Specification:
alpha+beta, Beta-Lactamase, binds the ligand *C/C=C1/C(=C/c2[nH]c(/C=C3[NH+]=C(/C=C4\NC(=O)C(C=C)=C4C)C(C)=C\3CCC(=O)O)c(CCC(=O)O)c2C)NC(=O)[C@H]1C, 2 domains, about 300 residues, six-stranded antiparallel beta sheet, homodimer
Chain lengths: ~300, ~300
């Protein structure tokens, strides 16, 4: 069972309790975007990332208590209609906002709360190539190469889970000069059980800068519930410090993975690294999510044979 | 063998490599004091903690290259005479400085380098009580109580090493309401082998604030050697982040220990905690060092019986 988060008196995580970190409720975000939460009926802004002024032009204490009707008059009606009470928490509303400089808006609903993520923003032959791979190994190779071409990441791996939850790099596409990880295996604890569970529900996550301090969300508890705000569905969620350290020690400045899900079970990850911090553009992330779903379908087919 | 320190490309320490942390050369200090290093012949200031202006009234780049003859005209001759080339690195010169507000100065020599520590500053019946204890347990109890009375620390333990380097609290004096650690045992890795080795040579160390960021020493390499500056003999040395985290998880804001050395081997520690950060005053530290040496002598006697 999860430890309380750090802002509810919980301990700092060590290797003795990797699996107890409540990674879904860090009460903080990554600094390359801003996050607000708002009441799902009134649109009242309830919580604000402390960097909100960087992206939204108003300080957290000024945004607090204003409504989405006032702040986002052109989106608020569409937002309400798209995300009614009781919809799945993976259902998203997306908009491109004009700002005096575009800003990508992504919204999802958890219970009675709307979670709004703001970040700056600017194939058919590839799909057929995945379809055309004659065996699992070839599929893995095509997938990693395709994703590397799409994203420009220094390394793209297909990381496969064994039944004991150990992991192995079974294919990779890599920049000239990087060491090989192909065939290397890793303990189950490197991607602990609560992360694997989260990754079965929320299919993409990332750390754009593995040295960047998390930006608090405040007030940290959702005022509706006096309880932590679920951020498993927010790509801007702060990453576990244990994993950030693993990445820094690996010389990785930016990391992103997409779940490969087969028969409702986490089969593996498309796992990406960059040496230098790097924000994969929002449109490239959406494409990569779609490729993950397509790869998932293809892996199910090839491994059966 | 030690990893390189973090400023020479070394990794961040994890539980897989506790013993490889080069804790003696962190290239940084605790913020409750200031540290300079100076050439042992010229007195030229070679390195400066980045907080030097807080204590010394001049910025690091202004202090750099000035001589101790200019900066400390009243102490420099005595300092030279007290710490000639080739003296033991545990030999100290101490002075009380008048400042516009006293400042404790502690100096030692390592090779051709003088290491100067600056921090703010403001029994016979007890010794006889240690002498008078009729057995090891009673000695342990008297020692912890005496140290607690001297220091005001919330907890004072006698932590004894077993031959396998596991540790046990064999006596303690504690504030009302604290849980007992008496009889609890701990793995050898909690005080890893390079720490135990350091603690056989340098008999007192502390962390005054277990949440305080370390203050860099710059330039970080000694310009004499283009190599790290040994800080094992400096009480202001930054503490291992692994240990700081252990203490925070324990609810300890301030920690200090004194080595108990029997037949040249590390027998145990007088180990002190405070819940709130706390700078044990310099004069109290000197007294506590002396009590450690006296306790060491007494333990040798009692355990033989
Ligand atoms: C005691 C806790 C530990 C720990 C926790 C942890 N790890 C993750 C997430 C990931 N770990 C990954 C591992 C690898 N990436 C690689 O490239 C390789 C080998 C080549 C390995 C073994 C990966 C891929 C992830 C997923 C996220 C990502 O793609 O960047 C989490 C969850 C992080 C989060 O979502 O907030 C946690 C809690 N990892 C350890 O090694 C120990 C120290
Ligand atoms: C993988 C590394 C780990 C680690 C490293 C570490 N620990 C120390 C120093 C100390 N540890 C102490 C342990 C205890 N204090 C207690 O009160 C109790 C139990 C009641 C224990 C087990 C102590 C007493 C010290 C000495 C310093 C002090 O008195 O505060 C070091 C060296 C620190 C330094 O001098 O810079 C290191 C590297 N400890 C772990 O638990 C693992 C994570």
């Amino acid at each position: 069972p999860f430890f309380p988060p750090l802002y509810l008196g919980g301990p700092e995580i060590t290797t003795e309790n990797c699996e107890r970190e409540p990674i879904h409720i860090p009460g903080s975000i990554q600094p390359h975007g801003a996050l607000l939460t708002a009441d799902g009926h009134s649109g009242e802004v309830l919580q604000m990332s402390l960097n909100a002024a960087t992206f939204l032009g108003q300080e957290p204490t000024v945004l607090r208590g204003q409504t989405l009707a006032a702040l986002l008059p052109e989106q608020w009606p569409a937002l309400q209609a798209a995300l009614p009470p009781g919809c799945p928490d993976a259902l998203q509303y997306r908009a491109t906002l004009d700002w005096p400089a575009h800003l990508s808006l992504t919204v999802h609903r958890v219970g009675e709360l709307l979670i709004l993520e703001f970040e700056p923003t600017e194939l058919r032959n590839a799909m057929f190539a995945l379809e055309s791979a004659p065996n699992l190994r070839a599929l893995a190779e095509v997938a990693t190469q395709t994703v590397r071409e799409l994203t420009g990441f220094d390394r793209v791996m297909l990381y496969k889970f064994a039944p004991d939850a150990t992991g192995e790099v079974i294919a990779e596409a890599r920049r000239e000069g990087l060491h090989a990880f192909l065939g290397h295996r890793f303990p189950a604890s490197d991607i602990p059980a609560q992360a694997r569970a989260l990754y079965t529900r929320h299919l993409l996550r990332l750390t754009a800068d593995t040295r960047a301090a998390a930006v608090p969300l405040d007030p940290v508890l959702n005022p509706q519930t006096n309880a932590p705000t679920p951020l498993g569905g927010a790509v801007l969620r702060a990453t576990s410090p244990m994993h950030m350290q693993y990445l820094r020690n690996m010389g990785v400045g930016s990391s992103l993975s997409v779940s490969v899900v087969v028969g409702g079970q986490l089969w593996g990850l498309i796992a990406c690294h960059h040496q230098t911090p790097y924000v994969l553009p929002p449109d490239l992330r959406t494409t990569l999510e779609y490729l993950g779903r397509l790869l998932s379908l293809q892996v199910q087919v090839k491994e059966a044979l």
